[PDB]
Amino acid sequence: GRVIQVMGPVVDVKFNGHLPIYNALKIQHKARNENEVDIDLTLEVALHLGDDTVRTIAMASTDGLIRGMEVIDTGAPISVPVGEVTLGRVFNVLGEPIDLEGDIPADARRDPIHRPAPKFEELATEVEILETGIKVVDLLAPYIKGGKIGLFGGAGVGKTVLIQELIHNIAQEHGGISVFAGVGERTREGNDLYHEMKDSGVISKTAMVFGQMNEPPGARMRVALTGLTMAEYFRDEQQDVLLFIDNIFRFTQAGSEVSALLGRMPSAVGYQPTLATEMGQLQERITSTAKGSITSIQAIYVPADDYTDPAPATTFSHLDATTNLERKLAEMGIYPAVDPLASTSRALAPEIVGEEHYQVARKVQQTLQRYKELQDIIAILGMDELSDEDKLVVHRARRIQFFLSQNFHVAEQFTGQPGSYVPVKETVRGFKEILEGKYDHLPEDAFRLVGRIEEVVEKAKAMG
Amino acid sequence: TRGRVIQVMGPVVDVKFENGHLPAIYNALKIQHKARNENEVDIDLTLEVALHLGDDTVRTIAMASTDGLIRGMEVIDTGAPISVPVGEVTLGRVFNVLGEPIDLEGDIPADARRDPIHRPAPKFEELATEVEILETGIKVVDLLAPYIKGGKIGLFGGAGVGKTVLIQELIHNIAQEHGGISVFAGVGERTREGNDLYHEMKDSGVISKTAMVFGQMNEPPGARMRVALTGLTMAEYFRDEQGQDVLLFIDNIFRFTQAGSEVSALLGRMPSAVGYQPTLATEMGQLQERITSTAKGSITSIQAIYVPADDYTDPAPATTFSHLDATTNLERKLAEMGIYPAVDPLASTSRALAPEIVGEEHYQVARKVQQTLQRYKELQDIIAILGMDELSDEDKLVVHRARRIQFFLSQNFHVAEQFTGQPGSYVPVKETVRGFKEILEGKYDHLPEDAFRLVGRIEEVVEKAKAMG
Amino acid sequence: SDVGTVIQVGDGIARAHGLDNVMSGELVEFANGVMGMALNLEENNVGIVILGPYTGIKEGDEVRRTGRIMEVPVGEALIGRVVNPLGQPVDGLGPVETTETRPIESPAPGVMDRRSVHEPLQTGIKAIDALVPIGRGQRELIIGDRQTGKTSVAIDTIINQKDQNMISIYVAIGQKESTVRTVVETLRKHGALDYTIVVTASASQPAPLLFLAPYAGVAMGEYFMYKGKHVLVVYDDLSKQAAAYRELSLLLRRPPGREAYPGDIFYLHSRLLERAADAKGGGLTALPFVETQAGDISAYIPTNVISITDQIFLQSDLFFSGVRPAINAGLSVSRVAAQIKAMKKGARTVEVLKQDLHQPPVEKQVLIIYAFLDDIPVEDVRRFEKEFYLFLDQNGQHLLEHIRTTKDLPLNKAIEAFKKTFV
Amino acid sequence: QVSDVGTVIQVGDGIARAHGLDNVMSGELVEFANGVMGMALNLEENNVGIVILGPYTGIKEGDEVRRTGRIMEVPVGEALIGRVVNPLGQPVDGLGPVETTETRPIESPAPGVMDRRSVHEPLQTGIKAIDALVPIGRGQRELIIGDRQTGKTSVAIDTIINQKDQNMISIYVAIGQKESTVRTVVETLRKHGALDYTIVVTASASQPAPLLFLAPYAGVAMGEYFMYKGKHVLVVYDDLSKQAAAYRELSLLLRRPPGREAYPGDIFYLHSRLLERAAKLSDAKGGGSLTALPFVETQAGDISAYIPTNVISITDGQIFLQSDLFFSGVRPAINAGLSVSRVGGAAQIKAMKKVAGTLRLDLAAYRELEAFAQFGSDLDKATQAKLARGARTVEVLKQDLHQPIPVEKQVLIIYALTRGFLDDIPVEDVRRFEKEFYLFLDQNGQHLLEHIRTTKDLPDDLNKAIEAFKKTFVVSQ
Amino acid sequence: LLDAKASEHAARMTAMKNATDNANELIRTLTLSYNRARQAAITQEITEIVAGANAL
């Protein structure tokens, strides 16, 4: 090629007949003089602008480039090293080791980060619930093996920590091939997580793929594909896989960053007119088949706490189970701050979770809602004019909304409390008694931040 | 140095000039033409360079009406952004955005100096260091809402609250005790209003000491948007040349920002939060920063902020507030009771009220006099309940003292002497501190209400106790 | 070739022909002497973002290259000086004789180039150094409405940097020049300029500057950080940056997203804060500011910077009500191990949390947070502090040294405390 | 010659971009070969946007466009009085042409700051509600804002009809209004004899936007004549909300960059530069006046709507007509609460000045109070007393339609209730009281109401006080 | 009774103030969220009207 137009992250490289879509152009140039800087960049063909020209999306700072430089077509999309070598390593958006331990073999299989989603014949149906040790989730919104979990939450709601507690509660004890790709998320997390992976004893069985807040849009654009292709390996080439994608939002977000420069007609809110489809082509790929299983848990940031925003909104129709985090519940001190009436799962069936677990499930939700409606009166007239029947519902509800709080092992260092994994049978039971009124004597605060229901009784007496 | 009219889109006019010489952005373009034939009508118009479109073509925004233009007219370049008269010429005078006197007192001679309305804010090294309070000699102000020398005060309200008088009195007290001139800038001034205002200052006589500018409403978005600058410029003179502390009044600074988004459209700007010119903060920042106390002089501005639909989050006011060092909140209530100035004692705030600034003495009494009010204010409910009897004596003392206090916040306005006859007052903060501290010690609780109501120094209240015979 | 010719001039945005050799992100130069960046590089023109007055630029003026991509003067010579986002001195103290230069847009320390935080940054502001600690290399967002004490906080934190080794950089964005000054001499009185850099972007200044100002600061900061030294940086209102950039962005006619802010309005702040963070010399703390309208944390920009920072909330009422600092202990929080061991381990506690502005050490601090008080009524409580403080600086002057040197307090003071009370 | 005409490139939606016309003034009338007139607004480099005033179908490409060299002016004279004409001045009433000698340009500058004299001389609306609570002086500007079917028109009408003895030469500008209504209205004027002083300028909802746009200014023009003479004009722009809209269309068609709510950036300048043209000329100028009555039609009564807001801030106060009041059978549907007249009181005459001062009070409290009756089953306090004459004043503020009231016998009834001379009478009988209390005066106080005329004062207080009893003491029940 | 009732009416007189007062605060909490939703709305409408023009 020859780059004749440089717009931010979007570069216009001009090419007869050469016309390389989805391919990777590397710009390999050396400083000819002192008025230039060495450029090592890889552009991803985006669209054909005509007149033998192509618009590309950079994978790093485009600073230093000039009109008339020389672009090379690698003649293939972004290929990433895949295989049993990817285990215990940290790659880039391109599949480059950033862990400062060696590089990757030339023999190593390099897959493209762009594949078509599995056909109707491939993808699985079968249902299996999966225990997380989280009272809320397991009861109100249980996760599914090989199923897709969204975590919706706004800023500083506990998304991250919730993930950590999952990897803690699950990834450690599964026996599975773990793939963790932080997309657009924090840089600190990467080091917090990478060096705790070594402590714990899985940095063997986990694949580390990063790009964070400091990388340009193009980067975050594909880090969710790069990491997906990794898990897609162990699924279609060999076992079950846990795909931990941290903030799939940053993917769509970075999307809008480029969508403008592509010369696209902005959609609602100024998002890319393709937002929907771009996510469709990266979701279904994260799925379990008849070949291998993929249980994925994705962090979903909520911009300005608006669940109506095209990003997380459009994301909803992509999950078998959701956990929607609320800022309100967070300031209440209810952690994880998980909406007990919003979070859902396809698992809540008697034909899945059993009757006993089902009825309690709704029973809780029922009484939580009945309390929700009452709130305007309480907020206006206090509890004085409520019936002796609605009051009871106010107590239960509260104490149930408090027992829905949990001690996350990845908490302690702050609060100082140790932590707990509450078995499903014990959550189911614990709430039963509460709905069944064995605890109507114990004060609320006793039920706050605990494990198995027995603990509440313990922390109860400790009160006096 | 001439150019010709290419396109005339309403208030937007394009000029383009023949090669070489292009007028700089913000330079004043004069179009004087033209009636050659009976098919034309004489043109006197001026324009301001906005954007260099290219192909030796500039986009200017007319400060007047573009009816009558025809493509081809020669546009003279003044080689400088809109200069306007500055000096002892301005005082007792009325101008427009251009600096052309709109009164009947004759025009400005070509002698008189003229300065460009656009210009950068004073250098970080120029404007001062110590935060010093500008003495208004008005009780309520100097005590509960002090003015910072070379700062900005929000003036809220203005239906029958005597806001005019409060301005009028302010121009007076400054020009006397501080010996410094005032410049009022009616931005989008409603003409009926602009007329009364002027006349009122002819009867009050506060005009002799002030420069009047009118950017009236029926003016085009350009005109209204730059009026503030004209008044400001005329003001800056007396700050830097004669090193004074001058007052700059802007009646409704929202008109300005509103004209701002209003112009922004015409130039084809993509709208921002609530259709506000994206360049809003910037346009406001440049208007305010040029208002301050230099190492030599100072400029205090009182801008009547008329907030958009009762929403204090609107980018328009919300922007303004960041430039505010003070607020004088006028309320019709205190007027109905016979407390003028109508300045609300608990609402009208200020940044100057702080021990760091006014020391404990002032801050103490002042913060106290507020407390004794927010006590008497809340007891309004209990007073209609348990009445003035046995409502808790630590309260009845409050209710008693408080009444005299909110009464001693009313003052004698010189400007008021016109129709009253009492000559009016000027009380230093010092005086105003004592009068309050003493009243807060209760040293006056034995004196009738209608004592401290419309007076000067505490000593005047006292003489007001001779009912004679 | 280098030299280009102006084609279109307006609103801080200028484009021109030629400049065939210009690099993307190369700070060009116009004839009138104004600096500018090259943002957009088209086939038939060059998008250039004027950094400075654009009135003196017309169609046809000459625009020359530099061959330097967006840098700014770095070195020691900056300390105690007041310069714009271009490093160019405004305090009228004469030019800055610097030697080395650093580029504005730099990649932040990689995952492997980072270490977890241990070393505390003591603000000296009790409420903070107790309830919400900040460790060197952290990012703690200080968020609050207009006039909640944000400014003061950062300032009391700066004087308090005289003991430990910390080079402060106070970058005032969109702030009143007048504010900047009064703020800059309070630093003089208390003698902070000896360790601090002050970069001012006044509200009178054009968008591009404010947009750059927060970066020109970190650049200047990384120098000492990348050198093993410890740095502290203040942005006052990242809000007028997000806003300033939003302006510029819309002037460019870049299609607007939510709340008018460009899609990249997140990246703008992310790639900035995601910069601050012993195989490298173990070297920068970030104290961002965000001004909220009517205490709305749920706002776009505000929530954003929260999803970045490792934050503190200043209530609107709790100031005017009489609480300085106005800290909101509930909604405030610190993620990052910082405390001193001495800190780690009701109506009277408030009076203690109340601190006088412009009067900042942990030593006699962890003590007052210990006391042995409840017997003394509220008013004289805060009052108590001043006394019981003096008395310790004399008698317990030996009891402090145990606190400092060991940063731990493993009975004595338990009695110490009956040394100054029973008196 | 070669330049001074042009050829039509594009036609549609009332707009024509022509070539040539290199000499057209921005705002010059341009005629099309088909006879249809127009106006040049966009003078660009390669073309000129014109807004066709009249049928645009009889226009195709290539049609010639020849200049005029005149800026949109209009007929003016003492012969329009009584005639119904369009914004062009073209008689549509179908009685002959309008024979006038002089003319005046639509676009005109407003009297200068100095040129005017603070309004003192009132405008008697003949409507108790208005000229008591929301008073309007000559040269003033009173915006009457309200939702459709609130009576906005009715007011203007009865107002005009109240201009016979007063010296007021009236002008009713109908913009966007149904030509149906405008006719039935111009007639009910016919019957009351308003045509002897009243000019009617119409552009209906069938007529093209540019006419609507021009109608208001075309109206003030004809007014301005009598003003600069020293006579007194009253212009009712009926519905600026529509005209302002018609401009939006026209301006959007010329593909002008649209602003908030699609309205052009100068949409504010539009009305501002219009309303200001109404004022009180200084004695130095013959002390003339042109009073303007801008209407604003409101949806849902949203006062926060863009256009309605602009004009609110432009006028000297406004009259807000409640949507519900109107149905509940309270005519006029005035909202005394939001309705305010800023120039107020210098407009009122002493005889009103007094008995009006308290009127606001009694009505004030009643507005803040009578939200409570049904809960007032326990009716308590003296808060019952405030309501007392309060609910009674409302009755007095209720007026008929097509039945103006002279100030003389108006101040008396606004006197009665405010002094208690009404209070002994239940609301049931309040309306049908003031009805004969007028006649009772037109026979027996015909002397008393005189002092009220010739002095505009009541220093009266004593006589009337007893003279009011002369009536209640003979009335029915 | 008389003293009982005297209380009743009183206790109600107040409980009906607490509600009024509280309800009044529910306004502030909403006035705020109304303005905010008044803003984002007038901002989205405009952005829509321009973005649909630049498309021409």
Ligand SMILES: Nc1ncnc2c1ncn2[C@@H]1O[C@H](COP(=O)(O)OP(=O)(O)O)[C@@H](O)[C@H]1O
């Ligand atoms: N389960 C929990 N127990 C105690 N504190 C928590 C819990 N979850 C979150 N927090 C607190 O809330 C804050 C938000 O943490 P984080 O998980 O980073 O939010 P997000 O990742 O959604 O931005 C943390 O500072 C932490 O102190």
